[PDB]
Give the backbone structure.
Amino acid sequence: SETKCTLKSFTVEKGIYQTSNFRVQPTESIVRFPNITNLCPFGEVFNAT
Amino acid sequence: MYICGDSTECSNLLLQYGSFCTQLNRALTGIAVEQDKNTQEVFAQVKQI
Amino acid sequence: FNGLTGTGVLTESNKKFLPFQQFGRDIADTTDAVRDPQTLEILDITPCS
Ligand SMILES: *[C@@H]1O[C@H](CO)[C@@H](O[C@@H]2O[C@H](CO)[C@@H](O[C@@H]3O[C@H](CO)[C@@H](O)[C@H](O)[C@@H]3O)[C@H](O)[C@H]2NC(C)=O)[C@H](O)[C@H]1NC(C)=O
Ligand SMILES: *[C@@H]1O[C@H](CO)[C@@H](O)[C@H](O)[C@H]1NC(C)=O
């Protein structure tokens, strides 16, 4: 069926056909940041007088 | 994979350009089959070993 | 990895990243490895699909 969709036809002749990828690759997500933990100075930028 | 490598948003955007990847794949497949035919015509003249 | 967003399989690599070197690129200027900020081991990237 992947081959039939690649050729946009319901009948397929004899031979080798390079098929396009109709499949679902991704599974999950991973986020790896540095451990640095200290708030940025923002009260002296926006709340300054 | 070349234009919008494993990116579904870019693949959906590329789908708006019509059958452009199909044309390039067809041309390259024709070129490869032509190379095989060139080798066969040059060397496989007589089929008696 | 530290803002290096990317979809693809991460696998342990045998590269010899120098201590200052962080990302690791290829000919096409596409990131094919990362040095993990948490563990200094490096991980190469293979696209899915
Ligand atoms: C500059 O000073 C202002 C003073 O208005 C700060 O705004 C205050 O920010 C705090 C912390 O985010 C807010 O408290 C939080 O508010 C809501 C209540 O529904 C909720 O998210 C939390 O439970 C918490 O109480 C506080 O309400 C807010 N005050 C006002 C009047 O909006 C501001 O954070 C300071 N810094 C900057 C960078 O603007
Ligand atoms: C943060 O601490 C972890 C251990 O908890 C360490 O492996 C990692 O290298 C640190 N990340 C930094 C300093 O960015």
Observations:
- Chain C has no helices and three strands.
- Residues 28 and 45 of chain C are 14 Å apart (CA to CA).
- The two ends of chain C are 21 Å apart (CA to CA).
- The pocket of 2-acetamido-2-deoxy-beta-D-glucopyranose (ligand 2) is lined by residues A 34-35; C 37-39 (CB under 6 Å).
